[PDB]
Amino acid sequence: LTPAELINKLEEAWLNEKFAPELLESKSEVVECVMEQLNHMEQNLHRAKPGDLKISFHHMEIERIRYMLSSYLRSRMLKIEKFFPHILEKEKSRGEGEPPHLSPEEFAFAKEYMTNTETLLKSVALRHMPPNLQTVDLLKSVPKPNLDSFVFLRVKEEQNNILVEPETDEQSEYAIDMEVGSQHLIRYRTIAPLVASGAVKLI
Template identity: 40%
Template sequence: MDEIDIESALNEIENESDDEDEVQISLPEIIQLMEETWLNEKFSPEILPNKMEIVELLLDQITTLETNLKKLNNSDFKKGLYQMEVDRLRFLISSYLRKRLEKIEIFCTAILEQEKLRSQQGKDNYLSQNELQFAQEYDQSIKDNFESVMRFCPGIIETQIISPNIHSMVFLKSKENIDGIVIDDGNDDNDLIDLTTGAQVLIGYKSISNLVKNGDVHLI
């Protein structure tokens, strides 16, 4: 009986999400996507466009599953397994969100400036609403704090904005056949390379940052 509850609850959610999204994408695929998003965020030097829709979808799933879990008998061996899966997904999501917060804390001024530029150009923001609010508050409190400290040593007003090193080297795996990626080797003569599906390379992030954002490659 309890199992049927979980099954029907899951089916319901699956149907719901199918209605919302035009693109049909199964839950295992979403988890796969979440893993790739997590790794991308982990290894890219700059903050990437947020994937909150995936996060929220998975969180919904987790909450439903957890409420259903409470109904399940404690002695059932399946409970442990369900709980383990929930824990695994939770880890994935929280590690992803934490990594983003970490980047926001380090590069907050740079990120806020880029976000401002993006909204002026009418592009989508990279930060989610909550992250943006966090970034602004964080930035403000850092500046306030800095100013109050600096009152004791007048004359120093120059501050340098910390921005990510977009030339850092990353490992990636290609999901498509891609031609003509420019390798910036620090000299003026730049080579071109082609990637085949499944190819793994070590390359400067700047050459492939667009491919990461549009999902043609993912970082590993």
């Protein structure tokens, strides 16, 4: 893995995270590698003599990569904040052998956010409520991801015999043979495993 391939993987993860309705799989290894490279390059730039153009080149590159990393992490944070209860419930019932969806820091942040929200709602309102009505189930109040949203994608590995609208026969053509390099407009529910396995890129 050349560093260029690491940057390309970071870009692909950023773009895939931006257009996905749910919270995709964590990629903490890429984050840590990119952070380490940036940290080393900061000192490598600091040592260099002032007045050199290489300083400008390296500083511009660092500013160009830090933005992408921050945007990816910000998207993940927003998605965690919008759907904390369902994400936490899915994390509790996680089975071994399945890739994790949350880094430990994100898991702690989600726990703290849920605790803050529950404590605030309880203290402000629920205390003075009638005794019978004082329990609110956050698993049935906070919204859920809309896995039926339409997305744009570019195909990397060929897939054949893909079923469009599997639950209805109203569609005239129900079979799609995706080639390599083509782009399609289709629902997210149909092609979620393809995005998960890296065979399809959301652009």
